[PDB]
């Protein structure tokens, strides 16, 4: 029984931690890239995330 809660907790933890990845975007926080790139270039970065 402890193993199922451990596995679900690990799955959720890695799912959360995947938000710190950039996947090649100039930054991982969507807000700052929207708040410093004009849309014609910011769309390209957003698509990768």
């Amino acid at each position: 029984l402890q193993d199922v809660v451990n596995q679900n907790a690990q799955a959720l933890n890695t799912l959360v931690k995947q938000l710190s990845s950039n996947f090649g975007a100039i930054s991982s926080v969507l807000n700052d890239i929207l708040s410093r790139l004009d849309p014609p270039e910011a769309e390209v970065q957003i698509d990768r995330l």
């Binding site: 100039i26 708040s35 410093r36 790139l37 004009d38 270039e41």
Partner: protein, 49 residues
């Protein structure tokens, strides 16, 4: 022997440089020239040559 002046601890109005037609070329990589009046930065280097 290009010079390097460090710029910090001030309010920098980039709009004058953006709007001034005295510049033959003003090309910017990484950030949009039209929003620089909004962002805040740590320090700024001007390499002049």
């Amino acid at each position: 022997a290009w010079n390097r002046k460090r710029i910090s601890n001030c309010v920098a109005d980039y709009s004058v440089l953006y709007n001034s037609a005295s510049f033959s070329t003003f090309k910017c990589y990484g950030v949009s020239p039209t929003k620089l009046n909004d962002l805040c930065f740590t320090n700024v280097y001007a390499d002049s040559f």
